[PDB]
Scaffold this motif. Structure first.
Motif, mmCIF file in Angstrom:
data_model
loop_
_atom_site.group_PDB
_atom_site.id
_atom_site.type_symbol
_atom_site.label_atom_id
_atom_site.label_comp_id
_atom_site.label_asym_id
_atom_site.label_seq_id
_atom_site.Cartn_x
_atom_site.Cartn_y
_atom_site.Cartn_z
ATOM 1 N N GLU A 197 36.125 43.327 38.161
ATOM 2 C CA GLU A 197 35.864 44.225 39.266
ATOM 3 C C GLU A 197 37.133 45.028 39.558
ATOM 4 O OE1 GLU A 197 35.533 41.768 42.697
ATOM 5 O OE2 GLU A 197 34.769 43.394 44.029
ATOM 6 N N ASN A 198 36.943 46.294 39.924
ATOM 7 C CA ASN A 198 37.935 47.083 40.634
ATOM 8 C C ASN A 198 37.468 47.154 42.088
ATOM 9 O OD1 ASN A 198 39.366 49.423 41.706
ATOM 10 N ND2 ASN A 198 39.731 50.151 39.613
ATOM 11 N N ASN A 199 38.224 46.553 43.019
ATOM 12 C CA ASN A 199 37.794 46.547 44.407
ATOM 13 C C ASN A 199 38.607 47.567 45.204
ATOM 14 O OD1 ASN A 199 40.126 45.232 45.328
ATOM 15 N ND2 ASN A 199 39.141 43.266 45.676
ATOM 16 N N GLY A 200 39.241 48.528 44.518
ATOM 17 C CA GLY A 200 40.008 49.583 45.164
ATOM 18 C C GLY A 200 41.379 49.129 45.679
ATOM 19 N N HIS A 201 41.730 47.846 45.504
ATOM 20 C CA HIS A 201 43.039 47.318 45.892
ATOM 21 C C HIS A 201 43.700 46.574 44.729
ATOM 22 C CE1 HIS A 201 41.771 48.337 49.940
ATOM 23 N NE2 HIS A 201 40.817 47.362 49.944
ATOM 24 N N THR A 202 42.881 45.899 43.903
ATOM 25 C CA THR A 202 43.332 45.154 42.737
ATOM 26 C C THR A 202 42.201 45.141 41.715
ATOM 27 O OG1 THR A 202 44.357 43.111 41.908
ATOM 28 C CG2 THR A 202 42.664 42.838 43.580
ATOM 29 N N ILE A 203 42.551 44.719 40.499
ATOM 30 C CA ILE A 203 41.592 44.395 39.454
ATOM 31 C C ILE A 203 41.399 42.888 39.524
ATOM 32 C CG2 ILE A 203 41.092 44.429 36.986
ATOM 33 C CD1 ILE A 203 41.168 47.193 38.495
ATOM 34 N N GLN A 204 40.128 42.452 39.637
ATOM 35 C CA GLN A 204 39.818 41.057 39.892
ATOM 36 C C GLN A 204 38.857 40.519 38.829
ATOM 37 O OE1 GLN A 204 38.159 38.712 43.785
ATOM 38 N NE2 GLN A 204 40.153 39.677 43.897
ATOM 39 N N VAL A 205 39.283 39.463 38.117
ATOM 40 C CA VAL A 205 38.426 38.712 37.214
ATOM 41 C C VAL A 205 37.776 37.570 38.009
ATOM 42 C CG1 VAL A 205 38.393 37.380 35.026
ATOM 43 C CG2 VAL A 205 39.947 39.318 35.289
ATOM 44 N N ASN A 206 36.460 37.689 38.253
ATOM 45 C CA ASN A 206 35.711 36.743 39.066
ATOM 46 C C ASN A 206 35.005 35.687 38.213
ATOM 47 O OD1 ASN A 206 35.993 37.908 41.834
ATOM 48 N ND2 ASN A 206 35.100 39.687 40.733
ATOM 49 N N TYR A 207 34.949 34.449 38.732
ATOM 50 C CA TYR A 207 34.261 33.367 38.047
ATOM 51 C C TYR A 207 33.037 32.945 38.857
ATOM 52 C CZ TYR A 207 38.059 32.520 34.647
ATOM 53 O OH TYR A 207 38.978 32.566 33.615
ATOM 54 N N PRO A 208 31.812 33.401 38.502
ATOM 55 C CA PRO A 208 30.601 32.958 39.194
ATOM 56 C C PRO A 208 30.397 31.448 39.164
ATOM 57 C CG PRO A 208 30.156 34.913 37.899
ATOM 58 C CD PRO A 208 31.519 34.410 37.474
#
Ligand code: TBW
Ligand code: ZN
Length: 222
Positions: free
Chosen positions: A58-69
């Motif tokens: 994800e790009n959340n407009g503040h950082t790039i985030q690798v999410n683990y569902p």
């Protein structure tokens, strides 16, 4: 409520933006910090149990985030088990070691059964392009959307085999700056390129590093 790193949004102002964000300025146990004076101590060893997973990037407009569902990527320390929820980055780093700032920082964010937060931080020095991160940098969205489980990643690769850490307590480094968070910062540094850091910056739109907060009554253990 909108927040950022420049203009009226900026970190000095996060407390004024909303009543929910007020601990960002009022609170006394905030991250990040300049690690300088440390008490030497017998810290429990970290055991890392990470593995190839399907992650959402994800790009959340503040950082790039690798999410683990899904769970299954864990860290054990002092008998408690913490589940990796996500990891993301700061360019430049947020924490410092004796005034030293690094080109980038990764924050691996966990929860245990009790809901206790714990962030584990990898600092990246200037050096070789980072091969192991290139998987992520390729699929990195450069606008406010998500690239979904077409994406395997093994976070094992991103941690060193030497797992010596500095230990203190503090906050989220982003609003609402919730305290209650255990910080383990690894003593061993990984490496990035200038081209990788700028790509991050291009994508996120700015440098996303909150200034260091006083340690106050807090002691860092070495
Ligand atoms: N810049 S950073 O590395 O400290 C941050 N990491 N997580 C943030 N916010 C969230 O993850 C949303 C949920 C949450 C809230 C409290 C604990 C754990 C997870 S800021
Ligand atoms: Zn962070």
């Amino acid at each position: 409520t909108h927040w950022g790193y420049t203009g009226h949004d900026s970190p000095e102002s996060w407390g004024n933006l909303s009543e929910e964000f007020r601990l960002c300025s009022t609170g006394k146990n905030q991250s990040p910090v300049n690690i300088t004076e440390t008490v030497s101590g017998k810290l429990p060893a970290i055991k890392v149990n990470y593995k190839p997973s399907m992650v959402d990037v994800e790009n959340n407009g503040h950082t790039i985030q690798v999410n683990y569902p899904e769970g299954g990527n864990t860290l054990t320390v002092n008998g408690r088990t913490y589940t990796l929820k996500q990891f993301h980055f700061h360019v430049p780093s947020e924490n410092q070691i004796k005034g030293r700032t690094f080109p980038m920082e990764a924050h691996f964010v966990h929860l245990d059964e009790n809901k206790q937060p714990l962030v584990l931080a990898v600092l990246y020095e200037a050096g070789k392009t980072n091969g192991r991160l290139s998987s992520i940098w390729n699929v990195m969205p450069m606008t406010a959307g998500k690239v979904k489980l077409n994406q395997p990643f093994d976070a094992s690769t991103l941690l060193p085999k030497r797992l010596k850490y500095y230990r203190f307590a503090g906050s989220l480094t982003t609003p609402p700056c919730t305290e209650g968070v255990s910080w383990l910062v690894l003593k061993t540094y990984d490496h990035i390129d200038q081209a990788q850091a700028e790509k991050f910056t291009r994508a996120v739109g700015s440098e996303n590093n909150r200034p260091v907060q006083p340690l106050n009554a807090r002691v860092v253990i070495e």
